[PDB]
């Protein structure tokens, strides 16, 4: 009968400890609160979005402040290839004296943590040189995060609180966010590179004091307005340019060499300057497309509801019925949130795919552990953003979806043939798994019997071609920018392949991660990845499409998104809900990204050590994965502390065991289910009311066991945290112990 | 001024959860 939780009278009238746990997992769910109307929903989400935005700037300011005050940034400028960076410092009272001596490292006074997130390489690239610029940018982000904390408070006051029609004005967001948030910010960063970062790259200090006096170019904005833009692409930084010095410098600010800087092995800063300038023009033009209050531009609701292609009657755009989709995207918030996580989930992995092969930061290709961590980080982030895309897409079909408004359109036609989607998804998952596992076990038995020539090894001849159709001479396919007589190589009418002499130097060197040499070991793992993508999608799509009911249980929409079961009847319905198909998929999604990051990590341990033959022989059969990668690399890690002493890897040796324990704890919530435990707690309730001194005190909330949906959350939480921390302790210390 | 670690870390280690949990326990158990 308490007044907590405030947002629910049905939870606040719960005598048990279920009141406490369901407050936490329904607190930020604004749509299920008591008395929440429609316009009060958007006005609360919009000001909450100022709260998460200001956490990000307060987070990024502690990266600047803990490096400026406790790191060795100014000592890292002198030699970035051997000086080992510092994240923050340790004040741990529980340390012993051999564990202060082991972490006093990288030339520091006290125990410091070696930074493996690569933020020294990004700050050194964009012009920052001393510890005062790091502190100045830190204090600026304190004020810039408080400017959003005040903005969220301001837009909750009654005449400053926006109306409902302001939120559902979707054509005006697309004009302002594309032109301004995307386009001007890409234009502003191109202004930051040309005025500041590229002159800082040439030993020439340009700060806040002297940027109004100094010009980035001795021509100085006269060739801009006259149309003589080729002056900006004069004498570039040469191939003997020592970075942040004046040796081999240039005067060009917008250049188009393509390929890598010869020392830092990163992209040229003049290439990035013409990039974000060209991206900015393509987006400001893109932001003048949709119709606002100025009576001009395209209208999306008319583009959906159009039925006539130049007089010919059609069903819609591409002769496909897209009517009502404008009132489906814009009216629902779970359709938007489920959509944009798929958009952000694609680009997040797409960030990671292009940052190991195309490094853009000074001296980051030679600092190995910072590069192995940034790939695996943004891959796991891309995992949750894709699982939550289908998760919040399936909350849409239960809660927000209306079949009458969406009648006859393309989203209705998917729900008709949904048994044909799940069947052919079930085919490819079984067609790959029966024949990919079959060829590893075939190669395992064949090598075990001492006759390894009977292996089934397939060259990836369809991705051999693409790397030779991008200019790799190493295979001898002789096509398409590797054929010097090609029409694509020469660009026959105009001959304007400026990028191409610098691109073919980068792709034909064996000293970078640009289009790595692939063989039969890489054939099996990309088809093992394709096993993991079509199977994780199988669980998520089938939970999305069957979210509104099926044969075993109709009207599943009447029970919401997360409900345990429907009893033992009809054979039982354990894990039937649409939430439960979110749940099964995150085992696969953590699995598949294991495969894509075990394979990423072990191909690069051959490149970084000069032993490419270890991977190409042993990655065809599953013992070579188990022996030469899991067994052989965990020798530096596990000896982080032994009865002889410690070293600087003893946190990662402790976190590795810590991860194996959180992982194993989560099995207890999943194998064992609730009704064992409610019959156990009822014996502890008995033996507390009978103990003579200890029954002076008594609970306010009656102890009950965790509910069925709850310990699938708590079981998946211990599983996922332990999956992350185990590999993240193995990824770092097996790389940072070998270099 | 590295002595601020001796005064912020025990406050966040000890004083911050004691002040938070003793507020929340008296707030969730409040008729």
């Amino acid at each position: 009968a308490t007044k907590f939780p405030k947002f629910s009278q049905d939870l606040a009238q719960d005598p048990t400890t279920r009141r406490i746990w369901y407050a936490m997992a329904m607190g930020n769910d604004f749509e299920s609160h008591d008395g929440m109307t429609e316009e009060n929903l958007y006005q609360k989400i919009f000001a909450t979005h100022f709260g998460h935005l200001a956490i990000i700037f307060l987070w990024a300011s502690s990266l600047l402040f803990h490096v400026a005050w406790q790191g060795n940034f100014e000592q890292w400028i002198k030699d970035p290839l051997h000086v080992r960076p510092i994240a923050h410092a340790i004040w741990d009272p529980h340390f012993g004296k051999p564990a202060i001596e082991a972490f006093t490292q990288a030339g520091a006074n006290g125990p410091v943590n070696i930074a493996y997130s690569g933020v020294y390489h990004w700050w050194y690239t964009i012009g920052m040189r001393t510890n005062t610029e790091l502190y100045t940018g830190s204090v600026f982000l304190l004020l810039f995060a408080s400017l959003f904390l005040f903005a969220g408070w301001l837009h909750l006051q009654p005449k400053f609180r926006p109306s409902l029609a302001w939120f559902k004005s979707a054509e005006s967001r697309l004009n302002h966010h594309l032109a301004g948030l995307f386009g001007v910010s890409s234009l502003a960063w191109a202004g930051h590179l040309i005025h500041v970062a590229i002159p800082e790259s040439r030993g020439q200090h340009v700060g806040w004091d002297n940027f109004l006096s100094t010009a980035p170019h001795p021509a100085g904005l006269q060739p801009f307005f006259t149309g003589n833009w080729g002056v900006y692409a004069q004498n570039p930084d040469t191939a003997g340019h020592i970075f942040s010095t004046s040796q081999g410098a240039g005067t060009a600010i917008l250049t188009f060499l393509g390929g890598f800087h010869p020392q830092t092995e990163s992209l040229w800063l003049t290439d990035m300057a013409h990039h974000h300038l060209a991206i900015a023009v393509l987006f400001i033009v893109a932001g003048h497309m949709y119709r606002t209050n100025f009576g001009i531009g395209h209208s999306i609701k008319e583009m959906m509801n159009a039925k006539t292609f130049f007089g010919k009657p059609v069903e819609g755009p591409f002769n496909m019925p897209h009517q009502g989709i404008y009132d489906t995207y814009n009216n629902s918030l779970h359709f938007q949130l489920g959509w944009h996580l798929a958009c952000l989930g694609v680009v997040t992995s797409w960030v990671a795919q292009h940052m190991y092969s195309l490094p853009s930061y000074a001296f980051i290709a030679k600092d190995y552990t910072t590069q192995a961590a940034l790939y695996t980080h943004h891959q796991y982030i891309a995992i949750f953003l894709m699982v939550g895309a289908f998760a919040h897409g399936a909350i849409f079909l239960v809660r927000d979806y209306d079949p009458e408004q969406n009648k006859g359109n393309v989203l209705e036609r998917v729900l008709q043939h949904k048994e044909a989607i799940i069947s052919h998804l079930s085919w490819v998952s079984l067609f790959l798994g029966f024949h990919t596992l079959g060829l590893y076990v075939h190669n395992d038995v064949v090598v075990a019997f001492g006759t390894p020539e009977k292996q089934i090894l397939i060259e990836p001849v369809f991705a051999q071609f693409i790397q030779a159709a991008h200019g790799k001479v190493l295979y001898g396919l002789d096509t398409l920018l590797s054929n010097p007589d090609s029409v694509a190589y020469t660009a026959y009418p105009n001959y304007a392949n400026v990028w191409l002499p610098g691109w073919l130097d980068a792709i034909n060197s064996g000293t970078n991660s640009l289009f790595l040499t692939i063989g039969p070991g890489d054939f099996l793992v990309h088809h093992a990845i394709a096993l993991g993508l079509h199977t994780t999608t199988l669980i998520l799509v089938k939970g999305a499409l069957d979210a509104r009911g099926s044969k075993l249980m109709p009207d599943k929409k009447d029970f919401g998104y997360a409900f345990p079961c429907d009893g033992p009847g009809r054979g039982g319905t354990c894990d039937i809900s649409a939430w439960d198909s979110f749940y099964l998929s995150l085992f696969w999604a953590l699995n598949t990204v294991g495969w894509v990051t075990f394979y990423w990590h072990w191909k690069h341990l051959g490149i970084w050590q000069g032993n490419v033959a270890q991977f190409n022989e042993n990655s065809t059969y599953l013992m070579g994965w188990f022996r030469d990668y899991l067994w052989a690399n965990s020798a530096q890690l596990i000896n982080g502390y032994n009865p002889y002493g410690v070293n600087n890897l003893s946190v990662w040796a402790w976190m590795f065991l810590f991860g194996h324990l959180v992982w194993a704890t989560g099995f207890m919530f999943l194998i064992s289910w609730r009704g064992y435990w409610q019959e156990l707690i009822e014996t502890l309730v008995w033996a507390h009311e009978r103990t003579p001194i200890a029954n002076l005190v008594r609970w306010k909330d009656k102890p009950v066991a965790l509910s069925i949906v709850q310990a699938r959350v708590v079981g998946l939480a211990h599983f996922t945290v332990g999956y992350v921390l185990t590999y993240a302790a193995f990824l770092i210390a097996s790389t940072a112990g070998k270099f | 001024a590295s002595f601020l670690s001796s005064i912020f870390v025990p406050v966040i280690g000890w004083v911050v959860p004691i002040a938070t949990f003793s507020f929340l326990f008296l707030y969730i158990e409040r008729e």
Binding site: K44, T48, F65, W69, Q70, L149, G152 | -
Partner: peptide, 30 residues
């Protein structure tokens, strides 16, 4: 590193979002 003085400026400036975060998190209701 940075001077001992500059750390105290960073702490006093950090009370300005610390005050405003307490105002936003309580304007969003109890």
């Amino acid at each position: 590193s940075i001077s001992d003085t500059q750390v105290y400026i960073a702490l006093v400036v950090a009370l300005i979002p610390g005050l405003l975060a307490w105002r936003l998190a309580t304007e969003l209701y109890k």
